[PDB]
């Protein structure tokens, strides 16, 4: 098998699951304000402007690529032990050529040990930020990612801002990226606060930490609480794609598949708490009995 975030199944499903809220997507920014511009419009041109807003909101809803953890690199290009006697602190040599991709750059270190070694991943990052300054990036590591600051920020329900902090500050395959990303998904798992990131571009991160960690609990419960059937069915479809051979998967698949069938079967065969999922699939069903 080859499931990945960038596969068209996981992409189209995370796209239909995320949802577009033009109110939360395009939000008042604390940037310096300028005076509003106005125009008179037809009905047709209003629909056109609508489709346009949606079309830009699509590229604004672009999801940051998820990546697994890089392996720390140590290799020595050379050694001269007559140079050990210098007794000077580290020299760091950085290649800047505008064309070279930042994955292709050479970051070099010469130590008091008089050996030529390749710089680490965090060191490569902070050097490429010193000599290719990028906004959002702090050369010295932010104090805000300490657990006290992180928790005080979570109380403020700012999760989207810490997730955005990590998108600019660190790199997608780095250690602290995945650290505080999955930590964020944790503290949105404990407070049932998932719907924060609903219209956010960070939704894919939610569904793809949570289908893998194999707790679909609060996400399915908050999906059948807002009376969205297709999103819970699509989430079950995702847990059916990224885990093809298992009891719940091939049984609740080969037997039969629909809203009621696959949602109730992947409710009982997902065993963390099935009482809340069956009680909520009883609740949206009695409220689908009452309104129709």
């Amino acid at each position: 098998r080859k499931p990945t975030f960038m596969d068209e199944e996981v992409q189209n499903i995370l796209i239909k699951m995320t949802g577009l809220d033009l109110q939360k997507i395009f939000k008042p920014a604390l940037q310096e304000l300028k005076p509003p511009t106005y125009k008179l419009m037809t009905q047709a041109q209003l629909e056109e402007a609508t489709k346009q807003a949606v079309e830009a909101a699509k590229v604004r809803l672009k999801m940051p690529p998820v990546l697994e953890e890089r392996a720390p690199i140590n290799d020595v290009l050379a050694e001269d032990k007559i140079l050990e006697g210098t007794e000077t602190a580290k020299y760091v040599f950085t290649d800047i050529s505008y064309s070279i991709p930042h994955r292709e750059r050479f970051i070099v270190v010469r130590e008091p040990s008089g050996t030529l070694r390749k710089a680490s991943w965090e060191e490569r990052d902070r050097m490429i930020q010193v000599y290719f300054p990028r906004e959002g990036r702090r050369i010295l590591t932010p104090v805000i990612f300490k657990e006290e600051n992180l928790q005080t920020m979570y109380s403020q329900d700012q999760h989207v801002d810490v997730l955005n902090l990590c998108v600019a500050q660190f790199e997608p395959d780095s250690a602290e990226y995945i650290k505080i990303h999955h930590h964020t998904y944790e503290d949105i798992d404990k407070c049932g606060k998932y719907d924060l990131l609903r219209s956010t571009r960070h939704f894919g991160g939610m569904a793809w930490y949570f289908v893998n960690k194999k707790k679909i609990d609060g996400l399915l419960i908050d999906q059948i609480q807002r009376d969205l059937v297709s999103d819970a069915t699509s989430l079950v479809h995702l847990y059916h794609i990224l885990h093809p051979x298992x009891x719940x998967x091939x049984x609740x698949x080969x037997x039969x598949x629909x809203x009621x069938x696959x949602x109730x079967x992947x409710x009982x065969x997902x065993x963390x708490x099935x009482x809340x999922x069956x009680x909520x699939x009883x609740x949206x069903x009695x409220x689908x009995x009452x309104x129709x």
Partner: peptide
């Protein structure tokens, strides 16, 4: 050494 790593890369 560094140029060697370059040509090799």
């Amino acid at each position: 050494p560094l140029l060697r790593a370059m040509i090799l890369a």
